[PDB]
Every structure is written in structure tokens, then in C-alpha cells.
Amino acid sequence: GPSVFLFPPKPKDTLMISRTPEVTCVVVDVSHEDPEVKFNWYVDGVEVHNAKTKPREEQYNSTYRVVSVLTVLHQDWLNGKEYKCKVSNKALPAPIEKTISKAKGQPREPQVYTLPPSREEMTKNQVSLTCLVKGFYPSDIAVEWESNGQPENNYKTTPPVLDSDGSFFLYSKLTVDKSRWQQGNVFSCSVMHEALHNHYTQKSLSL
Amino acid sequence: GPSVFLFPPKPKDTLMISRTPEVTCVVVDVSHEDPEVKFNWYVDGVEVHNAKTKPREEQYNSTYRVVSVLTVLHQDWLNGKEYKCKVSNKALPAPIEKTISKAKGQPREPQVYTLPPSREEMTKNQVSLTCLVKGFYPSDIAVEWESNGQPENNYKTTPPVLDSDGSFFLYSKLTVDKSRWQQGNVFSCSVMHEALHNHYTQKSLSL
Ligand SMILES: *[C@@H]1O[C@H](CO[C@@H]2O[C@@H](C)[C@@H](O)[C@@H](O)[C@@H]2O)[C@@H](O[C@@H]2O[C@H](CO)[C@@H](O[C@@H]3O[C@H](CO[C@H]4O[C@H](CO)[C@@H](O)[C@H](O)[C@@H]4O[C@@H]4O[C@H](CO)[C@@H](O[C@@H]5O[C@H](CO)[C@H](O)[C@H](O)[C@H]5O)[C@H](O)[C@H]4NC(C)=O)[C@@H](O)[C@H](O[C@H]4O[C@H](CO)[C@@H](O)[C@H](O)[C@@H]4O[C@@H]4O[C@H](CO)[C@@H](O)[C@H](O)[C@H]4NC(C)=O)[C@@H]3O)[C@H](O)[C@H]2NC(C)=O)[C@H](O)[C@H]1NC(C)=O
Numbered sequence: 015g016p017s018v019f020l021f022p023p024k025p026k027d028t029l030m031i032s033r034t035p036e037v038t039c040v041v042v043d044v045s046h047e048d049p050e051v052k053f054n055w056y057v058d059g060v061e062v063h064n065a066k067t068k069p070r071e072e073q074y075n076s077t078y079r080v081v082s083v084l085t086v087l088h089q090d091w092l093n094g095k096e097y098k099c100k101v102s103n104k105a106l107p108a109p110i111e112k113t114i115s116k117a118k119g120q121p122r123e124p125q126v127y128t129l130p131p132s133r134e135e136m137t138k139n140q141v142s143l144t145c146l147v148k149g150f151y152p153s154d155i156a157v158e159w160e161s162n163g164q165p166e167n168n169y170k171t172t173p174p175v176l177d178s179d180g181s182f183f184l185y186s187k188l189t190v191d192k193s194r195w196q197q198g199n200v201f202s203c204s205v206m207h208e209a210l211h212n213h214y215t216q217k218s219l220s221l
Numbered sequence: 222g223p224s225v226f227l228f229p230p231k232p233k234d235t236l237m238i239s240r241t242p243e244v245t246c247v248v249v250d251v252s253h254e255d256p257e258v259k260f261n262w263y264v265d266g267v268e269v270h271n272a273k274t275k276p277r278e279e280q281y282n283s284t285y286r287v288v289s290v291l292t293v294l295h296q297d298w299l300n301g302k303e304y305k306c307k308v309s310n311k312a313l314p315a316p317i318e319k320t321i322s323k324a325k326g327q328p329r330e331p332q333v334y335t336l337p338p339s340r341e342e343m344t345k346n347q348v349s350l351t352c353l354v355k356g357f358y359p360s361d362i363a364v365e366w367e368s369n370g371q372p373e374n375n376y377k378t379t380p381p382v383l384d385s386d387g388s389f390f391l392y393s394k395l396t397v398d399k400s401r402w403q404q405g406n407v408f409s410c411s412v413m414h415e416a417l418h419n420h421y422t423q424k425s426l427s428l
């Protein structure tokens with residue numbers, strides 16, 4: 015029978031009023047014999063009607079995939095409203111229901127600390143600039159790096175890790191040529207999170 | 222029908238000859254009617270006989286879970302031999318086969334760097350001692366902390382993260398009372414990985 019997957023908005027999309035956050039309800043394994051698919055959408059159990067549903071699209075394995083997109087209000091998501099997708103198809107004994115929302119719990123402000131390269135790493139051609147982000151809740155977060163107002167791209171960021179006090183932490187690693195670090199250039203780690211003022215902070219690192 | 226999932230040994234277990242690494246074949250969706258299941262195990266296709274089946278454990282959805290554990294030899298795993306679990310059950314038209322082995326490729330030695338707490342962090346009652354481990358392959362690794370020869374309890378380690386050159390990195394965070402750090406206690410990050418001499422290195426951190 016068909017399967018339903020419900021996807022949350024991206025962390026950045028709920029934190030910036032200029033962006034447009036969406037919840038996305040995807041149904042796969044829709045058969046040819048019962049290809050009609052109905053979507054109902056509920057917000058805290060109250061039905062809403064503004065979703066945009068796409069025409070079904072046959073896949074190379076001869077099943078259909080159908081997508082419904084519900085735009086959410088930033089403050090609704092951050093207030094913890096629950097979004098329910100109900101998917102009806104004639105091949106199903108009963109409609110499939112999925113629900114998604116922000117992780118429950120009291121938001122906690124991320125603490126952002128930058129850590130310079132270790133002495134021992136300075137023997138190499140490239141060095142590691144570290145951004146520790148700890149004590150935050152929920153785990154939805156975005157982390158970026160820049161220098162002189164331009165985005166540094168050569169970075170990797172670990173997944174959030176559940177810490178022992180129930181908050182989350184992560185590290186981001188930016189790799190730069192040691193000359194750039196030794197020339198005294200200024201590097202900034204940027205963090206977006208609902209519990210930060212203006213949903214954003216940056217912390218600077220340099221020699 | 223039932224499903225079979227096959228799990229590798231813990232990284233520490235294969236790296237230390239005193240420990241006993243095992244490959245684990247887990248079978249779920251075993252019915253309440255006739256919950257017997259037979260295991261065959263092969264190492265590079267040669268049948269072995271030292272596996273043990275654990276007691277059945279029924280689940281909250283009225284299914285059983287059945288586990289078979291095969292002890293493996295340290296170099297067999299490290300040399301990339303393939304372990305095959307064959308699961309036979311009356312509900313199967315034909316036996317299920319799953320196969321597992323170590324990630325393929327040239328092992329690479331971890332670089333281990335300890336990073337002291339940020340200046341900004343010293344206002345807190347506890348501080349974060351960081352161990353960056355980068356450039357290793359495969360991703361199987363174990364990290365521990367100690368001080369004065371005894372194991373520290375309050376640490377967390379991120380999962381390995383694929384770096385842009387195809388190696389892995391991670392960070393480990395040890396949280397200590399700021400007093401212990403300011404009194405100049407020496408703290409050590411321990412790393413176990415197959416590409417290290419004696420499968421082990423230690424790097425120390427202090428004020
Ligand atoms: C027939 O074909 C179809 C189509 O496949 C395509 O065509 C065929 C012919 C092939 O060529 C194939 O190569 C093609 O891809 C097959 O359809 C697939 O079916 C499987 C299930 O069988 C689906 O698997 C799930 O995938 C989820 C992840 O999906 C995303 O990521 C993958 C990449 O990994 C993408 O391929 C998908 O398209 C999804 O991409 C996401 O799409 C979102 C919606 O558009 C995006 O979000 C939106 O994005 C916009 C911007 O674009 C905005 O930001 C919006 O705000 C935002 O909403 C999102 O960005 C994008 N992500 C990425 C990374 O690109 C998995 O999450 C899921 O795993 C869960 O479920 C498993 C059980 O199935 C479970 O085991 C997992 O652990 C995980 O479990 C969940 O986790 C917790 C558990 O506590 C719970 O919360 C959940 O309840 C739990 N789940 C359950 C069920 O309990 C699945 O693995 C696959 O996605 C789907 N593909 C497509 C393209 O739809 C079909 O299977 C084929 N059939 C047969 C018989 O062969």
C-alpha cells in the first residue's frame with residue numbers, strides 16, 4: 015500500500031521572517047488501480063484549507079508520487095503548533111495520518127565559543143578553526159562561517175548531540191590555509207537559533 | 222514476513238585483543254505463532270558454527286525479537302572478511318541473507334588535537350575541554366577521557382563526520398568544574414583506531 019512521509023521546515027526558514035517555511039507531505043507507492051489521493055491538513059487538530067497539492071507524478075517503478083505543501087506561519091511553528099497530514103486513498107483500509115511539530119520543551123539559548131587551532135596543528139599547510147555551540151534547545155539550528163563579509167565554504171558541522179543536561183551541542187570546523195590564519199585575518203562563526211536575540215549571533219576568531 | 226538486520230562489532234572490541242568483538246544478526250517481525258528461527262553463519266562463504274542464539278524477547282506490538290551473536294576474530298574483521306547471516310523461518314518462502322564487513326579502503330591515522338576552554342567560557346561554573354580528532358579512515362573509532370589515570374564521566378563525543386577529503390573527523394567534549402581546570406590538573410583524550418600504533422594514542426591538556 016502507499017506510504018506517507020512528512021517533512022518539517024528548514025531551521026533557517028522559521029527563524030527569518032523574509033523566508034517562507036513549509037511542511038511537506040509526500041505520498042509514495044500510489045498504485046495505478048487506485049491513483050486518486052486526497053489530502054486533509056490540520057493545525058492543532060483544526061482543519062486548514064490553504065495547502066498546495068501537486069499533480070501526481072508517475073515514477074520509474076510504475077507507482078505514483080504525490081506532494082502537498084502547507085505554508086506555515088513562523089510564529090505558529092515556533093509556538094509549537096502541530097501539523098497533521100491526513101492522506102486518503104481507495105487502496106487503504108483507513109487514511110494514513112502523520113503529525114509533526116517542533117520538539118517539545120523549553121527553548122535554551124546557545125552558547126557560542128570559538129576555539130583557535132592547536133599549536134600542534136600549525137605544522138600543517140591547513141588549520142582547523144573550531145566553533146563550539148552548546149547548551150541549546152531544541153536541536154534545530156543553522157551554523158555558518160564567513161570572513162570579511164564573504165561566506166567561507168570549506169567547513170563541516172557535526173549533527174547536534176544530546177548533552178547530559180538535556181540540551182544539545184555541536185561543533186563546526188572551518189579549514190583554512192595556515193597563511194590566511196597567520197596573516198591575522200578575521201573569521202566569524204554565525205549561529206541561527208530561535209533562543210538567540212534576533213535569532214542570530216556571530217563570534218569572531220583571529221590571531 | 223520477518224526482517225533481518227546485521228550489525229558490526231563495536232570499534233573498541235576489534236581494536237583490543239583482550240576484548241571480544243561480535244557480529245549481531247537481529248530478526249524482528251517474528252510471529253507469536255511458531256517464533257523459532259535458525260541461523261547459518263559464513264565467513265567469506267565458509268560456514269562457521271560458534272554462534273549463539275539469545276532468548277526470545279517479545280515486543281510491545283506482539284512480535285518477537287530474536288538475536289544471534291557470532292564472535293569474530295580481530296584480524297578477520299580488520300582484514301575485511303565478509304560475514305553472512307542466513308535466517309530461515311517457516312514464514313519465509315526462501316531464507317533471508319544479509320552480509321556485512323568493515324568499510325573498504327586504506328586506513329588513515331587520526332590526528333588528535335586538544336583545545337582548551339574559550340576565554341568567554343570561563344565565566345561559567347563548568348568549562349569545556351575539547352578533543353578534535355580528524356583525518357581518520359575508516360570511521361570506526363572510540364574516544365575516552367581520563368585524568369590522574371582515572372576515567373572521567375562527564376563527556377560526550379559527536380558521531381564521525383565525513384570531511385571533504387573523504388576522511389572522517391569528530392570532536393569530543395569533556396565538561397569539568399572550572400576549579401579543576403584552574404588548579405592545573407592534566408586531562409587526557411584517549412583515541413583508539415586501527416591506523417594508530419598499538420591502536421591507541423593519548424593527548425594531554427592542562428593550564
Ligand atoms: C518507487 O519510487 C519512489 C520514488 O523514488 C524515485 O524513483 C525511483 C524509480 C528510483 O529511481 C529512486 O531512485 C527515486 O528516488 C520511491 O520513493 C521513496 O520511498 C522511500 C520509502 O520506501 C522514501 O524513503 C524515506 O526517505 C525519507 C527521506 O526522504 C528525503 O530524502 C531523500 C534522500 O535521502 C529524498 O530522496 C526524498 O525525496 C526526501 O527528500 C526530502 O524531500 C522533502 C520534501 O520535499 C524536503 O523537505 C522540504 O524541502 C523544501 C526545499 O526543497 C523546504 O525546505 C521545505 O520546508 C521542506 O519541507 C527535503 O529537503 C528533502 N530532503 C533531502 C535530504 O533531500 C526518510 O526520512 C525516510 O526515513 C524514515 O522512514 C523510514 C521508514 O520508511 C525509517 O526507517 C527511517 O529511519 C526514518 O524513520 C522515521 O524517523 C522517525 C523515527 O523515530 C519518525 O519521525 C518517522 O515516523 C520514521 N518513519 C517511519 C515510516 O516510521 C524514508 O527512508 C523515499 O523518500 C522515497 N523517495 C522519494 C523521491 O519520494 C519508492 O519507495 C519506490 N517504490 C518501490 C516499491 O520501489
Ligand SMILES: *[C@@H]1O[C@H](CO[C@@H]2O[C@@H](C)[C@@H](O)[C@@H](O)[C@@H]2O)[C@@H](O[C@@H]2O[C@H](CO)[C@@H](O[C@@H]3O[C@H](CO[C@H]4O[C@H](CO)[C@@H](O)[C@H](O)[C@@H]4O[C@@H]4O[C@H](CO)[C@@H](O[C@@H]5O[C@H](CO)[C@H](O)[C@H](O)[C@H]5O)[C@H](O)[C@H]4NC(C)=O)[C@@H](O)[C@H](O[C@H]4O[C@H](CO)[C@@H](O)[C@H](O)[C@@H]4O[C@@H]4O[C@H](CO)[C@@H](O)[C@H](O)[C@H]4NC(C)=O)[C@@H]3O)[C@H](O)[C@H]2NC(C)=O)[C@H](O)[C@H]1NC(C)=O
Binds near residue numbers: 229243245282284
Ligand atoms: C514491532 O516492534 C519491533 C520492535 O521495535 C522496537 O521495540 C518496541 C517495544 C517499541 O519500543 C518500538 O517503538 C521499537 O522500535 C520492530 O522492530 C524494529 O524493526 C525495524 C524495522 O522495521 C528496525 O529498524 C531498523 O533499525 C536499524 C537500526 O537498529 C539499531 O538502532 C536502533 C536505534 O534506535 C535500535 O532500536 C535497534 O535495536 C538497533 O540497535 C542496535 O542493535 C545492535 C544489535 O545488538 C547493536 O550492535 C551490537 O551491540 C553490542 C553492544 O555494543 C556489541 O557491541 C555487538 O558487538 C554489536 O554488534 C547496536 O549497538 C545497536 N545500535 C544502537 C544505536 O542502539 C536501522 O539501521 C534500520 O534502518 C534500515 O531500514 C530503514 C528503513 O527505512 C532504512 O531507511 C535504513 O537506511 C536501514 O537500512 C538501510 O538499507 C539501505 C540498503 O542497503 C542502505 O541505504 C542504508 O545504509 C541502510 N542502513 C542505514 C543505517 O541507513 C531500521 O531503521 C528496528 O531496529 C527494530 N527495533 C528493534 C528494537 O529491533 C518491528 O519492526 C515492529 N513490527 C512492525 C510490523 O511494525
